Design an enzyme around this catalytic site. Structure first.
Site, PDB file in Angstrom:
ATOM      1  N   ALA A  19       0.838  -1.209   0.000  1.00 19.72           N
ATOM      2  CA  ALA A  19       0.000   0.000   0.000  1.00 19.72           C
ATOM      3  C   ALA A  19       0.869   1.253   0.000  1.00 19.72           C
ATOM      4  O   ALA A  19       0.552   2.229  -0.686  1.00 19.72           O
ATOM      5  CB  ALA A  19      -0.921   0.004   1.209  1.00 19.72           C
ATOM      6  N   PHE A  20       2.003   1.179   0.726  1.00 19.31           N
ATOM      7  CA  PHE A  20       3.041   2.203   0.883  1.00 19.31           C
ATOM      8  C   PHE A  20       3.745   2.554  -0.441  1.00 19.31           C
ATOM      9  O   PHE A  20       4.369   3.615  -0.547  1.00 19.31           O
ATOM     10  CB  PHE A  20       4.079   1.726   1.922  1.00 19.31           C
ATOM     11  CG  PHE A  20       4.843   0.457   1.591  1.00 19.31           C
ATOM     12  CD1 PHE A  20       6.034   0.509   0.871  1.00 19.31           C
ATOM     13  CD2 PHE A  20       4.401  -0.782   2.043  1.00 19.31           C
ATOM     14  CE1 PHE A  20       6.756  -0.659   0.591  1.00 19.31           C
ATOM     15  CE2 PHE A  20       5.127  -1.949   1.766  1.00 19.31           C
ATOM     16  CZ  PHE A  20       6.297  -1.878   1.043  1.00 19.31           C
ATOM     17  N   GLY A  21       3.668   1.633  -1.403  1.00 16.95           N
ATOM     18  CA  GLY A  21       4.276   1.763  -2.718  1.00 16.95           C
ATOM     19  C   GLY A  21       5.213   0.611  -3.015  1.00 16.95           C
ATOM     20  O   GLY A  21       4.861  -0.552  -2.786  1.00 16.95           O
ATOM     21  N   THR A  22       6.413   0.935  -3.533  1.00  9.28           N
ATOM     22  CA  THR A  22       7.452  -0.038  -3.874  1.00  9.28           C
ATOM     23  C   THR A  22       8.839   0.559  -3.559  1.00  9.28           C
ATOM     24  O   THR A  22       9.167   1.659  -4.019  1.00  9.28           O
ATOM     25  CB  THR A  22       7.276  -0.616  -5.311  1.00  9.28           C
ATOM     26  OG1 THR A  22       8.353  -1.506  -5.610  1.00  9.28           O
ATOM     27  CG2 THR A  22       7.162   0.453  -6.397  1.00  9.28           C
ATOM     28  N   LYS A  71      12.358   4.690  -3.026  1.00  8.62           N
ATOM     29  CA  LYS A  71      10.898   4.618  -2.882  1.00  8.62           C
ATOM     30  C   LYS A  71      10.150   5.377  -3.981  1.00  8.62           C
ATOM     31  O   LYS A  71      10.514   6.507  -4.324  1.00  8.62           O
ATOM     32  CB  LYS A  71      10.464   5.149  -1.496  1.00  8.62           C
ATOM     33  CG  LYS A  71       8.976   4.981  -1.164  1.00  8.62           C
ATOM     34  CD  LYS A  71       8.592   5.648   0.139  1.00  8.62           C
ATOM     35  CE  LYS A  71       7.138   5.400   0.441  1.00  8.62           C
ATOM     36  NZ  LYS A  71       6.788   5.758   1.843  1.00  8.62           N
ATOM     37  N   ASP A 112       1.962   8.484  12.561  1.00  7.29           N
ATOM     38  CA  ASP A 112       1.990   7.099  12.114  1.00  7.29           C
ATOM     39  C   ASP A 112       3.138   6.304  12.752  1.00  7.29           C
ATOM     40  O   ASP A 112       3.777   5.495  12.080  1.00  7.29           O
ATOM     41  CB  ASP A 112       1.999   7.002  10.574  1.00  7.29           C
ATOM     42  CG  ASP A 112       1.606   5.642  10.008  1.00  7.29           C
ATOM     43  OD1 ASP A 112       1.850   5.405   8.805  1.00  7.29           O
ATOM     44  OD2 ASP A 112       1.060   4.815  10.769  1.00  7.29           O
ATOM     45  N   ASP A 147       8.910   6.898   7.497  1.00 16.60           N
ATOM     46  CA  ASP A 147       7.561   7.084   6.937  1.00 16.60           C
ATOM     47  C   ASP A 147       6.957   8.419   7.369  1.00 16.60           C
ATOM     48  O   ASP A 147       6.216   8.504   8.349  1.00 16.60           O
ATOM     49  CB  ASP A 147       6.622   5.891   7.200  1.00 16.60           C
ATOM     50  CG  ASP A 147       5.548   5.696   6.143  1.00 16.60           C
ATOM     51  OD1 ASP A 147       4.923   6.697   5.735  1.00 16.60           O
ATOM     52  OD2 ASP A 147       5.326   4.545   5.731  1.00 16.60           O
TER      53      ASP A 147
HETATM   54  C1  LIG Z   1      12.268  -4.621   3.600  1.00 20.25           C
HETATM   55  C2  LIG Z   1      13.059  -3.332   3.621  1.00 20.25           C
HETATM   56  N1  LIG Z   1      14.366  -3.328   3.555  1.00 20.25           N
HETATM   57  C3  LIG Z   1      14.832  -2.046   3.584  1.00 20.25           C
HETATM   58  C4  LIG Z   1      16.101  -1.442   3.552  1.00 20.25           C
HETATM   59  N2  LIG Z   1      16.205  -0.117   3.619  1.00 20.25           N
HETATM   60  C5  LIG Z   1      15.149   0.712   3.693  1.00 20.25           C
HETATM   61  N3  LIG Z   1      15.390   2.097   3.718  1.00 20.25           N
HETATM   62  C6  LIG Z   1      14.529   3.133   4.057  1.00 20.25           C
HETATM   63  C7  LIG Z   1      15.086   4.271   4.664  1.00 20.25           C
HETATM   64  C8  LIG Z   1      14.238   5.318   5.014  1.00 20.25           C
HETATM   65  N4  LIG Z   1      12.935   5.220   4.757  1.00 20.25           N
HETATM   66  C9  LIG Z   1      12.421   4.147   4.146  1.00 20.25           C
HETATM   67  C10 LIG Z   1      10.949   4.093   3.940  1.00 20.25           C
HETATM   68  C11 LIG Z   1      10.057   5.182   3.851  1.00 20.25           C
HETATM   69  N5  LIG Z   1       8.842   4.722   3.760  1.00 20.25           N
HETATM   70  N6  LIG Z   1       8.895   3.324   3.808  1.00 20.25           N
HETATM   71  S1  LIG Z   1       7.593   2.270   3.750  1.00 20.25           S
HETATM   72  O1  LIG Z   1       6.526   3.068   3.238  1.00 20.25           O
HETATM   73  O2  LIG Z   1       8.102   1.145   3.033  1.00 20.25           O
HETATM   74  C12 LIG Z   1       7.244   1.798   5.475  1.00 20.25           C
HETATM   75  C13 LIG Z   1       5.862   1.205   5.766  1.00 20.25           C
HETATM   76  C14 LIG Z   1       7.100   0.312   5.807  1.00 20.25           C
HETATM   77  C15 LIG Z   1      10.189   2.962   3.932  1.00 20.25           C
HETATM   78  N7  LIG Z   1      13.206   3.110   3.808  1.00 20.25           N
HETATM   79  C16 LIG Z   1      13.865   0.186   3.680  1.00 20.25           C
HETATM   80  C17 LIG Z   1      13.690  -1.203   3.653  1.00 20.25           C
HETATM   81  N8  LIG Z   1      12.587  -2.031   3.670  1.00 20.25           N
HETATM   82  C18 LIG Z   1      11.226  -1.472   3.723  1.00 20.25           C
HETATM   83  C19 LIG Z   1      10.376  -1.774   2.486  1.00 20.25           C
HETATM   84  C20 LIG Z   1      10.541  -1.711   5.065  1.00 20.25           C
END
Ligand SMILES: Cc1nc2cnc(Nc3ccnc(-c4cnn(S(=O)(=O)C5CC5)c4)n3)cc2n1C(C)C
Length: 298
Positions: free
Chosen positions: A27-30, A50, A139, A157
């Site tokens: 839902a957050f995207g990719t 992101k 959040d 987030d």
């Molecule tokens: C599985 C996984 N491995 C990661 C390695 N590095 C990051 N890096 C960052 C750094 C800062 N912000 C974010 C970020 C911002 N929004 N989101 S999200 O919407 O995916 C959040 C709800 C899980 C991640 N990711 C994110 C990572 N993930 C996310 C998809 C949880």
């Protein structure tokens, strides 16, 4: 009125970075794993990319860019830059251990009281910083806390950060759409509960529409088995009806720090201390010119 925000928004060229694989989608995207090789700088920065093409989606991701580019703290995630393609991409630091929620579920059998209490201090430090920056997260949850190393976590987030997740929301927020630093404190209590239960879903089975009535009746999340009354009492204080009666993030830093100095007195875990988690002092933790974003400055 308010101080001018002189944060720099860094525009990065598509050609300066590569996507390796998908880290997550929802839902957050990719979010994609990548490498950033700037200019003729002789550095390779491990990154997360992101992307949420629609004008309204670009507006929302640029609102997240605004907030993410404005924060600078060891326990908060900062924006490295943006790439202006057909879809606007956010370029952020790679948190190799992913989110804390999945980490506590996958590594349950190796997570001790010291790790749990330190994560609490770190989340409270990051939250206190957002309070100083007059920013209300709106959040905070274990899913929005990322793991740089098992000993270093950061809040992310900023898609809702201002100056619906019902099960993490303060009652004033569910009923009246009132969000304050004290409503973030409620969400902090729920985040702690998620950690102490090794990633349990709060109010599992209960529909979101029933939560407001449940909290009004005086029901709260149960005491996790590893929690002493000392730790549970803190969570409970975060879930008081009167927002001003809830602890302040600066008091949560203090309380959890005192506890982190003698963790076995506050959390009872079978086979604690003998539990080991990966450290930057351990084996296999081009790769030559690799620099973490925390070491790659301006
Ligand atoms: C599985 C996984 N491995 C990661 C390695 N590095 C990051 N890096 C960052 C750094 C800062 N912000 C974010 C970020 C911002 N929004 N989101 S999200 O919407 O995916 C959040 C709800 C899980 C991640 N990711 C994110 C990572 N993930 C996310 C998809 C949880």
């Amino acid at each position: 009125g308010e101080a001018p925000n002189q944060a720099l928004l860094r525009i990065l060229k598509e050609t300066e970075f590569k996507k390796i694989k998908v880290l997550g989608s929802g839902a957050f995207g990719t979010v994609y794993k990548g490498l950033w090789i700037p200019e003729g700088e002789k550095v390779k920065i491990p990154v997360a990319i992101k992307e949420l093409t629609s004008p309204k989606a670009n507006k929302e991701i640029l609102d997240e860019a605004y907030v993410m580019a404005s924060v600078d703290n060891p326990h908060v995630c900062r924006l490295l830059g943006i790439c202006l393609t057909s879809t606007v991409q956010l370029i952020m630091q790679l948190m190799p251990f992913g989110c804390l929620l999945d980490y506590v579920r996958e590594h349950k059998d190796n997570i001790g009281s010291q790790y749990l209490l330190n994560w609490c201090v770190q989340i409270a430090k990051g939250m206190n910083y957002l309070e100083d920056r007059r920013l209300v997260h709106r959040d905070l949850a274990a899913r929005n806390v990322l793991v740089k190393t098992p000993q270093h976590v950061k809040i992310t987030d900023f898609g809702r950060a201002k100056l619906v997740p019902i099960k993490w929301m303060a009652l004033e927020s569910i009923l009246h759409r009132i969000y304050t630093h004290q409503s973030d404190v409620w969400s902090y209590g729920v985040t702690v509960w998620e950690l102490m239960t090794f990633g349990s879903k709060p109010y599992d089975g209960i529909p979101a529409s029933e939560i407001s009535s449940i909290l009004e009746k005086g029901e709260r999340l149960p005491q996790p088995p590893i929690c002493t009354i000392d730790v549970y009492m803190i969570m409970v204080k975060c879930w008081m009806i009167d927002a001003d009666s809830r602890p302040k993030f600066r008091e949560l830093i203090i309380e959890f720090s005192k506890m982190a100095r003698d963790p076995q007195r506050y959390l009872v875990i079978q086979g604690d201390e003998r539990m080991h988690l990966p450290s930057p002092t351990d084996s296999n933790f081009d790769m030559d010119d690799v620099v973490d974003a925390d070491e790659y400055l301006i």
